[PDB]
Paper text:
[name] is a bacterial transcriptional repressor consisting of a zinc (Zn)‐ribbon domain followed by an ATP‐cone domain. [name] binds specifically to two “[name] boxes” upstream of ribonucleotide reductase operons, of which [name] has three: nrdHIEF, nrdDG and nrdAB, in the last of which we identified a new box. Tetrameric forms of EcoNrdR involve alternating interactions between pairs of Zn‐ribbon domains and ATP‐cones. Our results, in combination with a previous structural and biochemical study, point to highly flexible EcoNrdR structures that, when loaded with the correct nucleotides, adapt to an optimal promoter‐binding conformation.
Residue numbers in the entry:
A (entry chain B): 1 to 149
B (entry chain C): 1 to 153
C (entry chain D): 1 to 151
D (entry chain A): 1 to 150
């Protein structure tokens, strides 16, 4: 009984795309009874590791905390949201790849820096300025000299 | 590449029992290379996506913010509130149908433009004049002309 | 207690310029304790006539009902708020000028349209569409023709 | 010309009461020619001007919008919230000082840049990068070179 509108058991499937670099399956189902079509998300029953914050406190992985940081650094940058979601899926993929119960907050940060360098070099400097907490304006020139390698 | 352990593309499926009172599909998957087994949960996304506003800020979907815009354009028009609620439910339905975490504010606008075109063509012009921010009176005539060619056919 | 920052009772006055062609008095006041400068507008509270609505019901004059209708028509338009307030003050001035107990809602609407024609011609069409309740899309072309030829 | 009925310049004042907590001055004026007595209300102009956005659209002044921008630039900076509120009150003060019904969004941004230069020079660069929408990493070096002369 997959239909949520008329509550009919059989629901025919139309499409089956692979989103999130293979982490989940998006399907385009439609019920035979009513003329209503909807989307479904088949995801694997595994957990993203816990985050080991700067103050050694463990916290559940929140992809929105990760995303918001990136969007603040990308403020007026011409980087599409599909590229951002691709970078977020790749960082999650690499976090899963460790096979650890928990990952430090510093590891997530470095993986974002790794994506932002590819996405936008201005946005990368904006992120590093707060991520690495710049205490002098000279820290900006040092990150640029580091990036012109 | 559905495998989460070794990252192999092809993942064979073994079982498929409908669980959660038919609301979701619990399946058993097995990798072909690492030979591990895991559980899958296919659920319908029925939550309303976030709105990516004109200033790139994300905002929760507010059906009242959608309805007010329509009622301003539908001022003094003979379109009943049951037709308005039907149009609002159809726009929400189409927004759910995308299967997205967030939809742009522009997508919502285009969807109410097609509903208002069906509901009231005077109300549609009123909405389009602010939605598309008309800067000249000639823009009004252009929207009417690029409407009368459709009715002609 | 005229000071709004430190809440001191005595507030000394330095300047007094008559603004709005005598309709109000601008004055600079500077607190004695916090020493900060601010403006105070002395304006007259006058009687505005009652509004005889489309359904012949009388209603007190509403400067916000008047302003909101204009701002709905003036959506996304580049017309400054000083020009808007000038237009609203001129309509109120003309309403008072009749010297009548009550004015019809139709009189208010015509006066608003006279101001919107000067302010923004796109906004004028938006207002006229709801004000004159357009029943066909051809009503839009008629209002545009009614301005392009006879100014 | 304070008289609104006959339009006479000189208007004699008779009374001078106060709006509760001295927030306003009620007056009872009388014309010398038409001899009419009307009421006056002198109140402090504390409402903030409208913001003329980058796309010439007018918007009400939103303190949260102004403050949020500063707090994003002042992330992890040792600038206390009392200094931030002082800078926000000084920008609002300068906005009322113009005596205009509306101020451009660009003027607000320059006044924030003026405060952030005093508050934190790292935070000033962070604000300048988005405010002046940097399109190249070289824009950062240019803003720093501008600052190192003084
Ligand atoms: N719970 C979380 N889930 C996912 N990403 C997180 C989470 N907490 C932090 N992050 C991300 O980790 C990266 C680095 O974190 P950061 O360097 O800020 O350290 P922290 O110890 O989490 O402290 P804070 O967030 O207060 O700075 C950033 O991209 C941030 O958005
Ligand atoms: N949070 C929201 N939830 C639902 N509908 C919304 C929301 N925000 C805006 N809308 C609707 O989206 C459509 C188009 O929005 P619009 O073109 O106005 O752009 P915007 O970027 O949201 O800016 P604004 O609302 O200031 O015009 C309108 O029907 C509007 O009512
Ligand atoms: N009480 C009021 N005070 C001031 N202006 C008013 C008042 N009521 C209506 N107006 C204004 O009068 C103008 C014309 O009014 P309108 O043509 O809308 O007629 P109405 O009989 O008031 O009906 P409705 O407001 O329902 O349309 C508009 O600018 C409107 O904002
Ligand atoms: N309505 C508002 N009230 C108060 N401050 C505002 C308002 N809108 C913008 N600001 C502030 O004005 C300053 C400069 O604005 P900005 O340069 O961003 O231009 P804008 O035309 O408002 O466009 P944007 O949407 O990109 O901010 C910033 O400090 C911003 O926070
Ligand atoms: N204003 C900003 N400009 C550019 N990058 C920013 C800005 N604010 C945050 N970031 C980036 C770099 C930060 O290290 C990263 C994460 O932001 P941060 O405030 O540390 O919170 P967080 O996402 O770790 O969550 P929390 O504060 O709850 O621990 O986002
Ligand atoms: N006066 C009006 N006449 C006709 N249609 C209008 C009018 N005002 C708004 N609309 C229509 C077109 C607009 O693009 C749409 C949405 O209203 P708008 O004022 O833009 O705010 P919104 O609901 O999109 O977001 P927000 O609440 O964040 O401003 O409604
Ligand atoms: N969507 C709109 N677009 C443009 N102008 C509008 C819009 N809605 C209203 N107006 C303008 C033209 C209308 O004749 C005028 C008055 O608005 P209306 O909703 O009739 O209320 P009102 O101000 O007369 O109060 P009330 O309806 O309570 O009597 O405002
Ligand atoms: N991530 C950031 N790091 C540093 N400064 C920032 C950041 N984001 C914004 N700012 C500063 C500089 C911007 O010009 C200023 C205002 O932000 P902006 O996104 O332009 O919106 P705003 O406050 O003008 O409102 P809106 O865009 O909704 O009209 O705040
Ligand atoms: Zn069904
Ligand atoms: Zn495997
Ligand atoms: Zn923004
Ligand atoms: Zn109404
Ligand atoms: Zn004081
Ligand atoms: Zn609005
Ligand atoms: Zn008609
Ligand atoms: Zn007199
Ligand atoms: Zn924080």
């Amino acid at each position: 009984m997959h239909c949520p509108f008329c509550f009919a058991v059989d629901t025919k499937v139309i499409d089956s795309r692979l989103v999130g670099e293979g982490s989940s399956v998006r399907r385009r189902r439609q019920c035979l009874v009513c003329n209503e079509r909807f989307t479904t998300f088949e995801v694997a029953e595994l957990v993203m590791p816990r985050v080991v914050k700067s103050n050694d406190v463990r916290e559940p992985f929140n992809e929105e905390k990760l995303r918001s940081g990136m969007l603040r650094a990308l403020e007026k940058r011409p980087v599409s949201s599909d590229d951002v979601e691709m970078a977020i899926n790749h960082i999650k993929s690499q976090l899963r790849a460790t096979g650890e119960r928990e990952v430090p907050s510093k590891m997530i940060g470095n993986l974002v820096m790794e994506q932002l360098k590819k996405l936008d070099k201005v946005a990368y400097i904006r992120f590093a300025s707060v991520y690495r907490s710049f205490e002098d304006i000279k820290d900006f020139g040092e990150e640029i000299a580091r990036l012109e390698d």
